[PDB]
Design a protein around this ligand. Structure first.
Ligand SMILES: CCCn1c(C2CCNCC2)nc(-c2ccc(Cl)c(Cl)c2)c1-c1ccnc(NC2CCCCC2)n1
Ligand SMILES: Nc1ncnc2c1ncn2[C@@H]1O[C@H](COP(=O)(O)OP(=O)(O)NP(=O)(O)O)[C@@H](O)[C@H]1O
Length: 333
């Protein structure tokens, strides 16, 4: 196919449409390799993600298929939007790779976490994550795995969530809600805990709960926030309830102690620091029955200054062989 050309990207070969030029590797993960490129047709820089045989197993396949479908069943500036999708392969028999194209972003939220932000930028980023999550919820999509490596930003402070969230692979749990860690039921505000973890990390410049596994994760949570109420214990399955109730007890630390003044000059900034800590205290709540909702977070004074109805109330959205065919059909449309 004359429309495509191949480029060497590390150990991988990127076979892309000739419109994408000066391919440069910008990162990789378990799912695929990402390049920056110049799109000569749009006269814009783009990010190109290659999915190598996404149908290779149930985990890669479910994710690739669910993401391809959801990216069409979603329309919001704080959620990933595709510019293009293609395969260099001509037939289902030859089908191997899927290439996804979107606007090139400047940095991920990890990089943003490593810097000091003022309250306008910090509140604007959090407002955008909430707008993004609210849009997902309105379509019945509850993320459950928001993390800063899957959130990208531009120099103008605009933000996008790259994925749609939630089993053997031949993964980052730090932002997962207690009700996800403990196999409890969950509602929309499961995503509010992850936003709290991210916000807390934006302020501390350190992962709040850096667990090597779910056991370690649960200990780091209780060591800082304290042992949850008996009413929370009442919602756990007997086995999880016995394990959680037999863990070493902790009174927990107060939010001024957790996020000291040292982490936050002018009167404006003093008031905003007070409001940021109040919002952190409402999101970083173990019990989802007592944790603030996405709607109430958007009405919080720290966030409310950015409130725009057009952004908050935007119009709402197998075997290896079967997955191969389902993914191929989605790519071909
Ligand atoms: C590669 C850096 C960030 N990124 C990732 C990561 C996410 C965490 N796991 C590893 C990959 N996926 C995409 C991405 C996700 C979905 C699609 Cl469809 C496309 Cl094409 C790209 C982008 C990205 C997206 C846009 N711009 C950028 N820009 C980089 C530039 C260098 C600094 C980090 C951000 N990365
Ligand atoms: N906020 C963080 N601070 C520091 N290190 C982190 C943080 N989050 C994740 N990491 C590390 O960054 C590395 C990449 O993590 P991650 O982006 O979650 O994986 P991934 O394969 O790129 N995800 P995906 O694209 O969804 O398949 C791992 O070594 C993590 O332990």
């Amino acid at each position: 196919d004359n429309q495509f050309y191949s480029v060497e990207v590390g150990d991988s070969t990127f076979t892309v449409l000739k419109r994408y030029q000066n391919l440069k590797p910008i990162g990789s993960g378990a799912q695929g390799i990402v390049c920056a490129a110049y799109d000569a047709v749009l006269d814009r820089n783009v990010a190109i993600k290659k999915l190598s045989r996404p149908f290779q197993n149930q985990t890669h396949a479910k994710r690739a298929y669910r993401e391809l479908v959801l990216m069409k069943c979603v329309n919001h500036k704080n959620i990933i939007s595709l510019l293009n999708v293609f395969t260099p392969q001509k037939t289902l028999e030859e089908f191997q790779d899927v290439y996804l194209v979107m606007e090139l972003m400047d940095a991920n939220l990890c990089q943003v976490i490593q810097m000091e932000l003022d309250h306008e930028r910090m509140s604007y980023l959090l407002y955008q994550m909430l707008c993004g999550i609210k849009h997902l919820h309105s379509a019945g999509i509850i993320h459950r795995d928001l993390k800063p490596s899957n959130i990208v930003v531009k120099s103008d402070c605009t933000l996008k969530i790259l994925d749609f969230g939630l089993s053997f692979m031949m993964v980052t749990r730090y932002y997962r809600a207690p009700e996800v860690i403990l196999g409890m039921g969950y509602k929309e505000n499961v995503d509010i805990w992850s936003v709290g973890c991210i916000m807390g990390e934006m302020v501390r410049h350190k992962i709040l709960f850096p667990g090597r596994d779910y056991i370690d994760q649960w200990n780091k949570v209780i060591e800082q926030l304290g042992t949850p109420c008996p009413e929370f214990m009442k919602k756990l399955q007997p086995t999880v309830r016995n394990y959680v109730e037999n863990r070493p007890k902790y009174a927990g630390l107060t939010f001024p102690k957790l996020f000291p003044d040292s982490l936050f000059d002018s009167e404006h900034n003093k008031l905003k620091a007070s409001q940021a800590r109040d919002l952190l205290s409402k999101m970083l709540v173990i019990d989802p029955a007592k944790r603030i909702s996405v709607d109430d977070a958007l009405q919080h004074p720290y966030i409310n200054v950015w409130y725009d109805p057009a952004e908050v109330e935007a119009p709402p959205p197998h075997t290896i062989e079967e997955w191969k065919e389902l993914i191929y059909k989605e790519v071909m449309n």
